[PDB]
A paper describes a structure:
Previous structures showing the wild-type homodimer suggested a possible mechanism by which dimerization might control catalysis: By enabling the salt bridge network at the dimer interface the R576 side chain, situated at the N-terminal base of the D-loop, might lock the D-loop in a catalytically active conformation. To test that hypothesis, we crystallized the monomeric R576E mutant in complex with the nicotinamide analog 3-aminobenzamide (3AB). The asymmetric unit contains two chains - each with a 3AB molecule in the NAD+ binding site - that superimpose with an RMSDCα of 0.14 Å but which do not engage as a dimer. However, each chain shares an interface with a symmetry mate, revealing chainA-chainA and chainB-chainB dimers in the crystal lattice that share the dimer interface known from the wild-type structures. In our structural model, the salt-bridge network central to the dimer interface is lacking due to the R576E mutation. Although this did not prevent the protein from crystallizing in a dimeric state, analysis using the PISA server revealed a further de-stabilized dimer interface: The R576E mutation allowed a shift of the D-loop base away from the interface, whereby the distances in Cα-atom positions increased by 3.7 Å in S577 and by 3.6 Å in C578. This coincided with loss of multiple hydrogen bonds at the interface. It appears reasonable to assume that these changes together prohibit dimer formation in the mutant protein at physiological concentrations in solution. In both protomers in our R576E structure, the N582 side chain is observed in a unique conformation: Instead of closing off the NAD+ site, N582 folds back into the D-loop and engages with the G580 backbone, allowing 3AB to occupy both active sites. The observed structural changes in the R576E mutant potentially explain a modestly reduced affinity towards NAD+, as observed in our ITC analysis; but this is insufficient cause for an abrogated catalytic activity.
PARP15 is a mono-ADP-ribosyltransferase that targets an unknown set of proteins as well as RNA. Its evolutionary relationship with PARP14 suggests roles in antiviral defence; its localization to stress granules points to functions in the regulation of translation. Here we show that the transferase domain of PARP15 dimerizes in solution; the formation of dimers is a prerequisite for catalytic activity and monomeric mutant variants of the domain are inactive. Using biophysical methods, including X-ray crystallography and HDX-MS, we provide evidence for a regulatory mechanism by which dimerization enables correct target engagement rather than NAD+ co-substrate binding, and by which the two protomers of the dimer operate independently of one another.
Numbering used by the authors:
A (entry chain A), B (entry chain A): 481 to 678
């Protein structure tokens, strides 16, 4: 069940684990970030070990892999947020109330970026008075997707003659996506928290 | 995994099964309904066999039983809806968009009734031109609850000094509840669909 690289949690259902800079796991996440955010300095990277959120996410992933008949349903994406939202996200994941703000709506859902530089905007990873900013690296079940539009509350049907068989997510552009929106709980697992500064 | 009394689904992930009137399972659900709705005539009762919704619900129930350290977290409640919403609910369960309407708000969530007679109101189980009305019997993870209020988007904390440790649901009255509101997916499994008429 729980990932093999996680630390022992001593009966706790949640903990944050600071990664050691210079070691493999920190470097892997740092590189994902610096692909588009190399100008920023990372104060720390924390592994989020949230047993319940992980279990529910993995159940949804198995279901999506069965339904779609392939295992190309997951992306690793980013989500910048304000400091006040971090304790909630760490425990409960992303909800439209705290993770739904956007410049151009592709639907009423939770939004995630392909590039860290998008989530690094101050409108998302709001800096505090000292410029400290927060961004998650998120496992997202994007599955089969289509272009979104304002005012969706669920993804569209794949075929309008079968209104309940839905796309798994929507995007701004199916050919060259920069963001994805998901509408259901347990399609997004907050995997790492990156605290950084201009 | 899947309940023992379900029919074989022949590789399908969802099906509705009409119950035989006069037999045990129909009678058990009918009695739950007639406790407060004996004046109404039941056209049919259908068992909802939704494999994915069931799996995700059961994972959430196990998690709630672990977290609360008891197994008194589930209630059997009711939810009346319009005919146009039934195919979606059967496949995907209840969302605030289709299941959130209420006369007095105890929060922005999905609402369920203790008594069938509440869900039998036309404002919920909207009748069609012929008076046909629809009501679900729903397994709901009410867990530990508190009184709600307008404008909640998640249940309150159990202790405001620990803002992320939340009640599982809210109600109109903790001593004599008539309704419950839940805020997260997978806290409500549509178990039976009752089609009835004045
Ligand atoms: N909060 C975010 O990082 C984010 C990412 C992609 C799109 C939007 N609207 C927000
Ligand atoms: N839709 C319903 O049956 C229902 C049940 C309880 C409360 C509310 N507001 C609605």
């Amino acid at each position: 069940n729980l990932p093999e690289h996680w630390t022992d949690m001593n009966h706790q259902l949640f903990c944050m684990v600071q990664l050691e800079p210079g070691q493999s796991e920190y470097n892997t996440i740092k590189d994902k970030f610096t692909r588009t955010c190399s100008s920023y300095a990372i104060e720390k990277i924390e592994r989020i070990q949230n047993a319940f959120l992980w279990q529910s996410y993995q159940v949804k992933k198995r279901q999506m892999d069965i339904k779609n008949d392939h295992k190309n349903n997951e992306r690793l994406l980013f989500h910048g947020t304000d400091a006040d939202s971090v304790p909630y996200v760490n425990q409960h994941g992303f909800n439209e109330s705290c993770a739904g703000k956007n410049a151009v709506s592709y639907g009423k859902g939770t939004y995630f970026a392909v590039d860290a530089s998008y989530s690094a905007k101050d409108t998302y990873s709001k800096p505090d008075s000292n410029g400290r900013k927060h961004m998650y690296v998120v496992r997202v079940l994007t599955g089969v997707f289509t272009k979104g539009r304002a005012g969706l509350v669920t993804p569209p049907p794949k075929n309008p003659h079968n209104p309940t068989d839905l796309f798994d997510s929507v995007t701004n552009n199916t050919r060259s996506p920069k963001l994805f929106v998901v509408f259901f709980d347990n399609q997004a697992y907050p995997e790492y928290l990156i605290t950084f500064t201009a």
